[PDB]
Symmetry: D2
Amino acid sequence: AKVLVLYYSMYGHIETMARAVAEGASKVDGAEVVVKRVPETMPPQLFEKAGGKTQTAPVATPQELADYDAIIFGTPTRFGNMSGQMRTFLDQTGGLWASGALYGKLASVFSSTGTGGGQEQTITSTWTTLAHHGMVIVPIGYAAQELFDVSQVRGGTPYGATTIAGGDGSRQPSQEELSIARYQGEYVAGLAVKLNG
Amino acid sequence: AKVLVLYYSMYGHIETMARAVAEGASKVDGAEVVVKRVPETMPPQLFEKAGGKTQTAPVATPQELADYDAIIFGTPTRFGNMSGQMRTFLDQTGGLWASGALYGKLASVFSSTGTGGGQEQTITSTWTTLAHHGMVIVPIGYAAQELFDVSQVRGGTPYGATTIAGGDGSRQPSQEELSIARYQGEYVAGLAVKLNG
Amino acid sequence: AKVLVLYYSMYGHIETMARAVAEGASKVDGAEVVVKRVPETMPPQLFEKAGGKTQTAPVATPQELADYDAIIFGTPTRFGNMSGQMRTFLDQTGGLWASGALYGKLASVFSSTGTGGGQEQTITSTWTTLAHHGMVIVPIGYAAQELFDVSQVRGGTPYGATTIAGGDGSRQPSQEELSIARYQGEYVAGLAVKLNG
Amino acid sequence: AKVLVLYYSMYGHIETMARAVAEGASKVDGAEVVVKRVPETMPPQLFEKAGGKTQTAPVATPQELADYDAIIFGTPTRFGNMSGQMRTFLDQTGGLWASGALYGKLASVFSSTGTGGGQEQTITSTWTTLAHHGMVIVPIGYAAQELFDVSQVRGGTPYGATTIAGGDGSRQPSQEELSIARYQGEYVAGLAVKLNG
Ligand SMILES: Cc1cc2nc3c(=O)[nH]c(=O)nc-3n(C[C@H](O)[C@H](O)[C@H](O)COP(=O)(O)O)c2cc1C
Ligand SMILES: Cc1cc2nc3c(=O)[nH]c(=O)nc-3n(C[C@H](O)[C@H](O)[C@H](O)COP(=O)(O)O)c2cc1C
Ligand SMILES: Cc1cc2nc3c(=O)[nH]c(=O)nc-3n(C[C@H](O)[C@H](O)[C@H](O)COP(=O)(O)O)c2cc1C
Ligand SMILES: Cc1cc2nc3c(=O)[nH]c(=O)nc-3n(C[C@H](O)[C@H](O)[C@H](O)COP(=O)(O)O)c2cc1C
């Protein structure tokens, strides 16, 4: 089964999560795992001035999403929705929609926020779009034990992995957050192989 | 694979839809299909005096949900949520949650409304609960061609089948609506057999 | 203006929050503030055996909601929805709906969860029902400074105040959580007086 | 009071609805109504070649939103979310967010879809973003009697006005749909004047 980890990141938090998701998915033998980012929509000069992070991941095309058995989408929140960059990219999948190209493929979502608020809404609003394409939606539930720990500030929900970046973006994804992300990658890839071989 | 069509219906619109879902599911070789309703929560006298419909489907226990590979949940809307009956029943699945009993099982949802409003929100808000149980959520997308037909008033969404009961409850599920319902059962039962034999 | 704080609580977390909300609302001169609970739906013997908390607040009727200019709803989560008790109560407001009795009245929501997951979904899914009644929906945004603090585990979202009860229910609402709850009460009551005098 | 009808439209269906919203709002004595569109994000050549409609409304800046007492947002759906154009624009309101510039301002939403699916989710997912800004969210409920009419295919929800463009975009907003749109503008403008003079 082929598993695409497709993400948008400005300051690297989602990028770090995406690598963890891919690390989990890769544990599944017979899962072929690929990490790509959506295009930046900001002018390059404004991106740089804002202190955005340069990223090694190849830039995806909308069309190539059809090549995968499972797609795990990562996006930071923008006021409780996916980012404009991820939205713009998904708005370019009308050809895929019309051909039923993503129908029955697995979909799962992970997110990042500054201070936690909107992390659930970002994931479930993204599920809406996945459903229009007839993708099978994969939440993570409470298999990841870290979800029971309320001793430290941490992202992660039953809807999908998340990270808390801090108001000023200075936090890095924690061990527990990354664990949950790895689990989500393992679980989705396992399902993809179960379904598609 | 074993498929439970689990529903609440007061006036029979969801009951009718549930039978169509079960019909569709039973078309799949290897699928064992069972239809049950959740308990009424209204006092029986008030149920009858409001004109509630007597139903032949047996009443489910929370515990028996563990026995199935796929559960297709049907509920009328109550102001854009699942009904109190369905909510009260799902509130009794804490034991199943604690044991991971529904984890990884397929889930899908169908709804009914008087005049359309809330039919999407009923489905997607039900998905939230399914996700807490770690169920794999199955939307129907646009595979059912009736979804393209805007020439007549018609339930059905990419999130799941729906029916429009009319303001006074006098409408009966239409052929197009029942077709989408059958498609949903068949599709989900197919996935269930693919995953579980 | 008359402000109803209407809540459901099994173990007292929402009850504690509700009192804080009422404490905030009462700071607004010319706001008349009342706290009531929805009926328990569990058999009394099962409630007691589960270690449920007895509560002094009077039990509301559905009809009396019409008497208020603003209603602030509190409910614990059940898998990312409002509780069956709150759902059952709201399912009894069909008379109010048909008469437009809650139309244009202010609505706001607060929630409680064991470990955080579902706290956003509980609030926004509740908003759906409020919208069917034509209630004006009042989120709190980020006026409450505590929402910026990620140094300690704490509830509170831009959608409404929340508390984290812990997996075993042993946590009590924190100073920061209660502050946010008080703010929500103050803010809603201020709006109610602005609108209705 | 000042009312901004802020919209995105590619083929004019939301543009038509926006004009009706503005018509309704202008009926309120004391309401100053302004209609503006968000910037196109598609390359101009691709916009034209796809048959995009030239529009007379001026393009808004993020900054000018601060000048209004009520903002009524219109967007077509993109797979059950707001359009990338509207998302990209709202993503540029971080400055306004940081200063509390939209806090306590009225907000309301209207949508358009090809065949109905996603019209509710578009509205409610837009509400999420409004809530992060602390805006007071205004659904329309069932005040508009057309919402009771299931005899013809018709947009409109208790969450806000909608229109059905048809699979091929050839439908024009109907009289019933435009009536609901006008009602929404009038209602929101009335609240704006009540609160702000
Ligand atoms: C336009 C905008 C909107 C934002 N909205 C929220 C929000 O609603 N809640 C939150 O906690 N953080 C919010 N943030 C913070 C971002 O989610 C955060 O910077 C992002 O998760 C960092 O991930 P990245 O490093 O992968 O880009 C917002 C930031 C921007 C620029
Ligand atoms: C409490 C209550 C709330 C309702 N809310 C809505 C609603 O938001 N939208 C709608 O179209 N119909 C609404 N209705 C209509 C029911 O959804 C409708 O009667 C039901 O779908 C019929 O299905 P059934 O025959 O399976 O019971 C409501 C009915 C009741 C009793
Ligand atoms: C049926 C059931 C479902 C629950 N679902 C969740 C959940 O999804 N997320 C969560 O963090 N806690 C969940 N809990 C915990 C409750 O939300 C928690 O006990 C409640 O917030 C306590 O508030 P109270 O003291 O006011 O009753 C659930 C508890 C029960 C009994
Ligand atoms: C990328 C894309 C996604 C779309 N998704 C949906 C959809 O989920 N449901 C639907 O009914 N129409 C969908 N459509 C149709 C648009 O919502 C429709 O063309 C729009 O409402 C027309 O409004 P406008 O004339 O103001 O641009 C989609 C169109 C595009 C281009």
